[PDB]
Each structure stands twice: as C-alpha cells, then as structure tokens.
Amino acid sequence: TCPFYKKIPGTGFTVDAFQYGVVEGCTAYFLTHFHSDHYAGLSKHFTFPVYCSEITGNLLKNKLHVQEQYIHPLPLDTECIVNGVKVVLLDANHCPGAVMILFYLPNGTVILHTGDFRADPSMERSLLADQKVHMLYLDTTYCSPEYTFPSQQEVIRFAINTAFEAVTLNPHALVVCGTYSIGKEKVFLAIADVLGSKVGMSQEKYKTLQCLNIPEINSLITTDMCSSLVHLLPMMQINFKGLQSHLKKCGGKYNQILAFRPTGWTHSNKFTRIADVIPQTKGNISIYGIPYSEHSSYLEMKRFVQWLKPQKIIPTVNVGTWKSRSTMEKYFREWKLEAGY
C-alpha cells in the first residue's frame, strides 16, 4: 500500500508510486525521474496515464517498453492542465530528465514536490518566484550538517586535471569510469573531451545515453571499445579484481588503469579537501572516489527552504526511522526560527 507522502491531497495524483498495484483513487501517475527506486513497478503492461518530462518518456518507451499511448511528456517551465488541475514541471538539477512538480490545487493551496534535487540559487529565479507555496514534499537525503561536499565544477576540475596528467605521463594508460544508473555523465564526458577521445561502452549503456537529448552526443560516445581510451564499466566492476580482468581483455594496448568511482558523500568528506584526495593503488591500478553529488548538501537545502518559506514540510527520504524523523523535524524548526517565517 502506497504511503501518504506519495499522495497529492485534493487531487487524483500520485508521485513515484508504481510498485503498489492499482492505487485507489489515482487518475494520473507522475514520475519525477528515471531512477529504479522511483520507477519500481513500471513495464510494457502498465495501462494508466504516466506524466513526466520528454527525456523520462524516451527512457520509459525504449528501456522499459511502456506503450506510447500511456506516455504523456510535458514541456518544462510551461503551465499545463492535467485532469482539471494546473501543473508546472521545473528542472530538478538531478540526473537528465529529472523534474520538480508545482501543483495548483482547486482550493487555492500550492504544493511543490522536489522529486530528487540538488538545490541551487538559480531556482530562486524560476517560476517559483511568482507565488506562495504552502506545502513542500522535500528530498531530505543529506539533511544533517555533516554532509558537506564541493561544487560539481570543482570536482570535474579535479577529475580532468588528474586524468590529463596521468595519460600525458603514460600514453599507454586507460581511464575507466564506473556507472549503474543515469546521472553524473559530466564525469566521463569531461575526461574524454580533455583526452581527445570518445567514451566507449556496452550496447545497453549506449542505448540509454541515446535517449537523453545531450547535444552533439554522436560525436562523444561509441560502442567501439578499441577506438576509445575512456571506458565505462558497471560500478560493481570498479575494484582491483574487476579492473585487472578488464586490462587483460584489452590485448596489450594498455599497461596501467586510472579509475573513477563518482560516489555521493563518504566520511572521507569530513576531514579532507577535494585538492587533497588520493587514490587506492595496487600495482598498475589506481582507484579515485570522487564526491560528485546530484543531491543537495545540507547548506544548499537549508538556503532553498529558508528562501521558499513553506508552511509545512513533508520529507520524502530518511522517513523509515524515528531518530531520522526527529532529527529532520528539529532542523526544520531551527530554520524557521532563524529566518522568521
């Protein structure tokens, strides 16, 4: 049964609620983004209207085979009427095609559902600037002050400079980047661009990337592994055993691996600056864990909320334990007392 924080009151709508069977009273199912914890339950046998971005709808049709007649893609930043209710989709600054959803209820209440997001000051000049929001359904993934990480731009600077130095020292070094979902494509695209290479990958991953409307993508990626010196592998293979096995398959073209694991936060964040990050090394293999986040840091989240000044907050992440719930509720009250709303 569907939990309350996935239901939009005063509508027939649910958000990211596909694993509960037929939800009683639901006339339209919204999907914020194409990550498995959110789409869990969708398939070619789904027969209710799904509302989403264009990029998400490309993924639903090509990867999950949802039939076209049930996919309802909406343009961003545009007022649309769904089953008698005005909605807007906004860029979530998460993975490709990820949105926040503004619902203008028939009684005058305005609700923002962030989906998954990485809050940014640029959101203060979107269509959110124009009216009051009563209720916020918030991605609380990193809602605690220990969760610090650098900007995406600092992290990409570190990756490009590290890869360019290693390969210029040793033109027979291969770069490998780990992946297990969409998101974080800048990591492997920025490294391949500094090296003058395409990114090489499996047919299944190439298919996924071809759904993402990235400009000039045919110029940047390939299934021809032999022609590429930046390879994408599943995240599970980014370890000394998996990388040794891969290097064997490359037929003596390469004699060293430099590998990247874009994690979110790890506790090595609490002590060390990005500048000071070092790899784990074994022989001719080195592995870097880089803190590339597609979720808000604590400070980014707190700024967004203190700007928006909602009347009520409903967390959508970390909701399963009483300790987590109590921690989050204490920060929400602090924020509100400090800002005065």
Q: Binding residues for Ni ion, per CB under 5 A?
A: 35, 116
Min dist CB 15 to Ni ion, Å, is 13
Question: How would you classify the pairing of strands 80-82 and 85-91?
Answer: antiparallel
Given the complex with Ni ion, which of 178 and 200 has the nearer CB atom? 178
Min dist CB 211 to Ni ion, Å, is 16
Total count of residues recorded for the chain: 341
Q: Alpha-carbon distance 220 to 191, whole Å?
A: 11
Given the complex with Ni ion, which of 228 and 293 has the nearer CB atom? 293
Q: What is the dihedral of CA 61, 65, 68, 72, to 10 degrees?
A: -60
Min dist CB 180 to Ni ion, Å, is 12
For residue 82, the SS3 value is strand
Given the complex with Ni ion, which of 35 and 118 has the nearer CB atom? 35
Min dist CB 113 to Ni ion, Å, is 13
The answer to whether residues 54 and 75 touch, using CB atoms and an 8 Å cutoff, is yes
Q: Alpha-carbon distance 92 to 106, whole Å?
A: 25
Q: Alpha-carbon distance 70 to 58, whole Å?
A: 12
Given the complex with Ni ion, which of 35 and 198 has the nearer CB atom? 35
The answer to whether residues 38 and 14 touch, using CB atoms and an 8 Å cutoff, is no
Min dist CB 121 to Ni ion, Å, is 21
Which two three-digit tokens encode residue 113?
């559902």
Given the complex with Ni ion, which of 35 and 302 has the nearer CB atom? 35
Min dist CB 118 to Ni ion, Å, is 10
Given the complex with Ni ion, which of 5 and 335 has the nearer CB atom? 5
